[PDB]
Amino acid sequence: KKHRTSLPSPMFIWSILRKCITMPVIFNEPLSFLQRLTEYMEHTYLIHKASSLSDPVERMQCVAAFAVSAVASQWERTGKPFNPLLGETYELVRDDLGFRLISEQVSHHPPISAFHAEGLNNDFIFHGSIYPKLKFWGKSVEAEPKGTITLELLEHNEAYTWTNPTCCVHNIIVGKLWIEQYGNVEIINHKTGDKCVLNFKPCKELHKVEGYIQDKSKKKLCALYGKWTECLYSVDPATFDAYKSVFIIPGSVLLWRIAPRPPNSAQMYNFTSFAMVLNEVDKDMESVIPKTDCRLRPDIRAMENGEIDQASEEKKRLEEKQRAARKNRSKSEEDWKTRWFHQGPNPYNGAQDWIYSGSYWDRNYFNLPDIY
Amino acid sequence: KKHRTSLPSPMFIWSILRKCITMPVIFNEPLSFLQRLTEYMEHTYLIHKASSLSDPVERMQCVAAFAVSAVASQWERTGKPFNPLLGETYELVRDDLGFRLISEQVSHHPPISAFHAEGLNNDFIFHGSIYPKLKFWGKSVEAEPKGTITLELLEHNEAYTWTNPTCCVHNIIVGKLWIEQYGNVEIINHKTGDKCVLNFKPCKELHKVEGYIQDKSKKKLCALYGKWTECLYSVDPATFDAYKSVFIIPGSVLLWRIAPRPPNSAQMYNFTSFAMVLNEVDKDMESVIPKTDCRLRPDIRAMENGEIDQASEEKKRLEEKQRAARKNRSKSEEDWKTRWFHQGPNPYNGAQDWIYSGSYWDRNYFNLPDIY
Amino acid sequence: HRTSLPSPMFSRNDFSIWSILRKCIGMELSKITMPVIFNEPLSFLQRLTEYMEHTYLIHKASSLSDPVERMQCVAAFAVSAVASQWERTGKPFNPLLGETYELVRDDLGFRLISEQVSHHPPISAFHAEGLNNDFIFHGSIYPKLKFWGKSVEAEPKGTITLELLEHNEAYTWTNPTCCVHNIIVGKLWIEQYGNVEIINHKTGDKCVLNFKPCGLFGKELHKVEGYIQDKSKKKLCALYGKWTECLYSVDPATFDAYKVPDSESVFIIPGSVLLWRIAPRPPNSAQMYNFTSFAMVLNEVDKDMESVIPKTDCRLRPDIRAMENGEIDQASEEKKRLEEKQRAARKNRSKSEEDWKTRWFHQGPNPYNGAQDWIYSGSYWDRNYFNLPDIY
Amino acid sequence: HRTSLPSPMFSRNDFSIWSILRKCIGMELSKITMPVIFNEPLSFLQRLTEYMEHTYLIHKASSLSDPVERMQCVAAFAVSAVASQWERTGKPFNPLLGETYELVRDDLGFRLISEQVSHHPPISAFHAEGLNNDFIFHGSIYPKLKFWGKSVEAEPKGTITLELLEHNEAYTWTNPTCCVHNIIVGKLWIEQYGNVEIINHKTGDKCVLNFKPCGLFGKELHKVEGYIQDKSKKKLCALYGKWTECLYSVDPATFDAYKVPDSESVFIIPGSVLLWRIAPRPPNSAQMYNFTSFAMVLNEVDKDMESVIPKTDCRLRPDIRAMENGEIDQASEEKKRLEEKQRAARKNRSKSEEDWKTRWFHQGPNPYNGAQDWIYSGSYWDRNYFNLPDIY
């Protein structure tokens, strides 16, 4: 009996390692991204002011003031908001600031959140969608709210479009996490031909916003300066040029000052007084709001309750039921239907945009997505 | 309508990270651990020699020579052998070296491998079990073959027990992997009262084995020196004392020299000529060997074929079917039964030991474990 | 003898413990060097010079008196400047603060001097002049790297400036972004995209080049589509093609009439005029880190250079030499060594509180777009080098 | 101008690429420091001295003339020497090469001098003398750490030697292993196990102490069971108990008649005689890194010590000071600093090729078991310190 003196094949990539080897809720804040998007509304008084003004230059100031304000609550809000489930809605009615705002998570890959806002007196519509495109930039993560933001001043037959600056989270790997916001922002008034430029200057000039307003002719009509953590000012351009808390240039005009976060704040995730109301519920509101409102979302619920262990268990559950829901539509050939926004041309730029489908505030909700 | 000014719970371990965040076959050699255990037999001629000798001192030399030889093929065998499945058997009959050896993987937690060897002329039995207890020691892994090894010389009414030294794999994290073997080894001849001490010296004196033989009275009768990678020698103790490849002390006696690895070797995982036969099959052997022989194990099969991708897929499958098999017995209250070894007193030490159940070489296999 | 330690042990249940795990893990993490094994034997300062490969297009434009016909050559140069990128998944060495690279070609009619002008952020400034005194090509590149998913982006932040001296006119543009797909997991492939505007600041002529992204099914891979328009926004040319291969030009009105992945063939619109075609890579290419012949010249040295060039020149950079000589084992040790000499120099300059001095470039506004830029400080081609920094 | 690089690019498909990933990853990995956050404000040289807490047992044995009755006191000392381990899941600082620790207690009748005598392997040598000139307690400890599963083992390799000078007799033993269960995942708990043989080399008396392991359901946790036997292997005593609390002794024949987890109560076999009982930890304990009162004295300092003690003494160790003062944030920076000063000293001694000199200990055989050991070189209590190494 004769045996073999050699092996058949002589002795001799990441695939093997990949095949054979979520986010911690301790890094979230108790807010859906949709709710973090409604903080855009924190200073809706500027919109209402804008609508009551005759001169479009003065009107562009308040919209410029408002655009800065809608991204102003983010200082020290280093908690990531929960990525909204597909079909997650969120509504907010505020009787004092005079608006209603429905938002719906439209897609999940990529994550797109659609929102529609209306003044209660029918003076404005505010709408758009946001994809927060996350990019690891060095030792920091960038979030970039991709998407146009459209504000229609109904009493004035005009609409303003713009996009938001980039929101950067530094020291994400090491050090005290902190928020920067930089980018340039053009506000086009599509009736007048008026343009407003807002540079959110990057860091010294921390939080520094500088910019100007010009007519369609391209004549500057005022400069705009301040910090998105505090305030914006308008001033005559000629004296702003010569003259480069906050440095108050002579004869400037206060356009906006940040709303109030409570002394309780740094114990409550640095939420504003506006933010503290976002995720609240009560027996009345339970009957009316739909089953997709993120006020009925157990993990944000349980985290706001302190039950963090129950929050991370509940979070992984929804995400899993959401994959599973995707794979059944992946096979059953059904494809997802957006209850409250449909897709369509933005008429002021011709760029695809999500468009409110109507009928939300009628209630009588029917066949809603069962996403919890 | 009045809203809330604070959250219910103020804002505020590894569990979350653990719950919400195999071995690569590229690190194995194509051998079951059971097969790597049969390399103990590579020099069974020393056993047969031992059995033909009248003087037990001379007999203790050959058993000491054999004990060193059974762990000598491990130099440069830096490939881990596949952890044997529960129920994996392995048989080897060699007509020239004169033995049969059945081994069976007895348990999996911990991994215990049982083996029984018999000389074909009924001159010896060689048996024991091995648990290779792995410990990460610094920049190296230690494997320690826990368990007694019992060699019975049937023509001489005697039995020797001993345990194996520790097998250390250096530079496991960084550098060229390489094998060291260290430890002290006592060989007790239980009839004569004779003892043989083998120190496997740790590293300079790389692979250095030194030791002695003494009677029950505790009189040294010879020294024993050499290297487990090459050879062992006996020499008069009096001249070994005075006198401290290999340093040949005057008037020494060659007890053993390592068997032959082929020039092909370093292309074939550094297997010996003995090792190259272990995992071989053929149409004859297929009819006879049981369904648990690791010659019928697909991943060791496919890896020996070079099909490494198919090997790592096939490996994870068996391990998974093995967990699944465990969890069904975890519920169905069935518990695993060892086909060929039962547990019992080692009579020469009173220490629990696995004991051959008989009947293996009768074939007529019945109801064997379906482990592939 | 005391009954207590001066301060109780600090608690694990309180989350104050992992922010010191945070502090110590990152002091270790940022220490680590990127393995030479993902680099290619090129300093970014050298990768920057490949812009110049097709300088014959600047010379073409220098000698055309139709402004738009000059624009068609600058756009040709803009597209060609980024063409060598295809299949260049090696990451050129980040240049050490103080690194220079000079390249003189007489067959091509230019001489170029680059300096690594800052290390955080890593900014490369370059200045190239025509030898017939017919252009200045100058600017700066800050490669902003961004990871996500499987992809790495490098956005080259910076204004690039072609001044055609014989026409008293100057073009500015900003290059497209370069994506590298399937890092770690899969086969690497290179994509370039982003809108490039080229402006003739004299005439008001605007070139729009949209480097189209892959899109679904990989259909628009490498496609480049755009126009040239006059100061009043009327299209005079359509431009199209792939930036890996060719740029065509054609009547705008007819272009409107016609409106690891593999690229699509260029459909040659009737009446097109080829502006630029790539010179194919040598058969050395896929074995030679996918260099073009031009790229294989950059780190070449003779002792006739080593006397003339300054000591800072990256042709004298050891780790890039080690890697090119195949000694990749040494190259990560040379890399390790240089990245610590540079730390030590800069911390040393903090205990001393001295500001670092760029030898060949200074800061100043771009007079064409008001951006802050980097401007040649002169005297580089004098030789007479003095007090240069010791960086190797 | 060359047409190729001097050497083709080396391939990823060939597995020659990851062994340079291997080379570079480990040069980074072994650099990293263990976070101070798992340590406790004690040098191992100090953790070593806690053996001495119950020296009153040596003094008991020094003054007994029945040899076996002396054995019952050495075994009492052996068990007591390892008692403070319970709930000590902080890992004492690995002592720097050159570290010493001295401890003088007159209330306890001993004076001890330890030196860290090698860094790889980390070997601690110690020598303690009775002040009444009645014993020498000396030996060395190499803590061989071994990880697997959730558990870390520290096997203290070394021979420990009690010479009772008034009886011309000497005991040798080797301590048990100390397991730490549920590292990272779960609550840490400490277990000691291993067979300890104590030999009276004069009389031939053997003490066997089996520190029993936990076993299934945690039933034998901390139990210690053994006997004392004469030179002809006859049991004169059974010993039993838990090493956390007590050691009893009893007629051997009656003991045979009786043959995070919580421990079991000690069943007090009729006719037992208590040999040793632990002194309970203070209520400070669980807040004070679970020190016993003795352990809380070790790093204590007065300026009256800092003049007398040498500069190497670990009471003068900064990172251990930082940690004890609560400044744990600084302690990992002091740790970082010291572990690199020590590397730099030893590599420096390689460029110079000089061998390191232990000041207070030298190597030599143990005359009792032939093992190689560490032996006091004298002169430590003279003071008159000279040329000591600068290690802080």
Swiss-Prot record, chains C, D:
Compositionally skewed regions (Basic and acidic residues) per UniProt: 332-343
Similarity-based family: Belongs to the OSBP family.
Cell location: Late endosome
Superkingdom assignment: Eukaryota
Domain notes: The FFAT motif is required for interaction with MOSPD2, VAPA and VAPB.
Subunit structure: Interacts (via FFAT motif) with VAPA and VAPB. Interacts with the GTP-bound form of RAB7A. Interacts with OAS1B. Interacts (via FFAT motif) with MOSPD2 (via MSP domain).
Region Disordered, annotated ranges: 323-355
Range within the parent protein: 533 to 950 of 950
Function, in words: Binds phospholipids; exhibits strong binding to phosphatidic acid and weak binding to phosphatidylinositol 3-phosphate. Stabilizes GTP-bound RAB7A on late endosomes/lysosomes and alters functional properties of late endocytic compartments via its interaction with RAB7A. Binds 25-hydroxycholesterol and cholesterol.
Stated name of the protein: Oxysterol-binding protein-related protein 1
Coiled coil stretches, renumbered: 319-355
